[PDB]
């Protein structure tokens, strides 16, 4: 998508941007005290945005 906008050469694929993520951490600096899958991913709950629009 970067260097083939004017060209017709376009792959059969894509991407996703996911704006406004928020990271949340459960174990402070020793995440293995919570669980084992919490050690695989260190904190990073990666919460999705669901916010109301601003009027103007």
């Amino acid at each position: 998508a970067r260097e083939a906008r004017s060209r017709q050469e376009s792959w059969p694929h894509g991407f996703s941007e996911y704006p406004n993520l928020a990271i949340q951490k459960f174990g402070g600096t020793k995440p293995q005290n919570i669980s084992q899958l919490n050690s695989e991913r260190y904190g990073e709950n990666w919460l999705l945005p669901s916010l109301p629009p601003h009027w103007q």
Partner: protein, 305 residues
């Protein structure tokens, strides 16, 4: 089951530190379960003595502010925390993260009881407002409106009373009071139809919900497929995990005269509308639906479409 005979309008309330993190996958505006628990608390405190039954809340959210920050070189955000007191022996305490937010929201609520008479017309709404000031909405206290320019009173608007032209005049005079806001509604049939559309020889259930929230800026020529309005995922109730235990068996319960049951979150879809493109104000009300023998403790906006 219920259709309100009158509406009560509380003016623009303010909440200083509400709950931002509403669910294990979403953040932002709080859950409507908090508002339904709030109106049930108002019913338990005032509704018994005045012979009125309060049920249903329309959420507006005139404005919303969150206490977040974006780190340098990253597009993700983090929360601003508090500093709890020390444990003992001078040791600092382990941090447990939580988010906060500031809300300005008004809510209209439908009363249907036969305890409204000819003499009580305005003191009912005043007695409701005087009790809804010393309470909290999502863990955040309600700001009390001290000495300012001009105050804001409640309203007790009867639904069936009046001609049909006067009925549309009453609907317009109520809609003018909350026009610069929005409204949260539940769209489950749209999510099910998009499930039926997206399922084309492949199995998927929950990435459907992830698809309606992201920005599909990818397409073969690029093109950005749009969506109808602000679509947002919300926590719409719980689902059961364990069988229901008898009221005195769970060790360290909240109270010992209620059956206990282990549940988990469910996820649905919702939309933020404008309150002038609905033409029905007995709509937009949220209700509980329990089904106590199979779990699935849900809340929704019925009779919408």
């Amino acid at each position: 089951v219920t259709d309100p005979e009158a509406l009560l309008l509380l003016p623009r309330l303010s909440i200083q530190n509400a709950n931002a993190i509403s669910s294990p996958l979403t953040w932002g505006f709080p859950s409507p379960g908090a508002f339904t628990g709030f109106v049930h608390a108002l019913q338990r405190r005032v509704g018994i003595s005045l012979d009125i039954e309060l049920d249903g809340v329309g959420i507006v959210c005139h404005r919303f502010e969150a206490q977040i920050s974006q780190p340098a070189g990253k597009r993700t955000k983090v929360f601003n925390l508090t500093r709890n007191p020390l444990n003992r022996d001078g040791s600092t305490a382990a941090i447990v993260e939580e988010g906060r937010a500031h809300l300005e929201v008004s809510l209209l609520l439908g009363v249907h009881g036969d305890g409204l008479d000819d003499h009580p017309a305005q003191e009912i709404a005043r007695q409701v407002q005087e009790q809804a000031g010393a309470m909290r909405l999502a863990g955040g206290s309600i700001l009390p409106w001290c000495n300012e320019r001009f105050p804001a009173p409640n309203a007790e608007l009867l639904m069936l009373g009046g001609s049909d032209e006067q009925r549309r005049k009453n609907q317009r005079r109520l809609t003018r009071r909350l026009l610069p806001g929005f409204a949260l509604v539940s769209r489950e049939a749209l999510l099910q139809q998009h499930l039926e559309t997206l399922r084309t020889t492949l199995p998927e259930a929950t990435t459907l919900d992830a698809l309606l929230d992201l920005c599909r800026i990818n397409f073969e020529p690029w093109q950005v497929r749009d969506k109808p309005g602000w679509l947002v995922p919300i926590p719409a109730g719980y689902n059961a995990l364990s069988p229901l235990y008898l009221p005195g068996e769970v060790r360290n319960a909240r109270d010992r005269e209620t059956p206990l049951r282990f549940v988990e979150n469910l996820f649905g879809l919702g939309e933020w509308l404008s309150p002038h493109r609905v033409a029905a104000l007995s709509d937009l009300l949220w209700y509980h639906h329990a089904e106590p023998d199979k779990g699935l403790y849900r809340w929704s906006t019925p009779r919408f479409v």
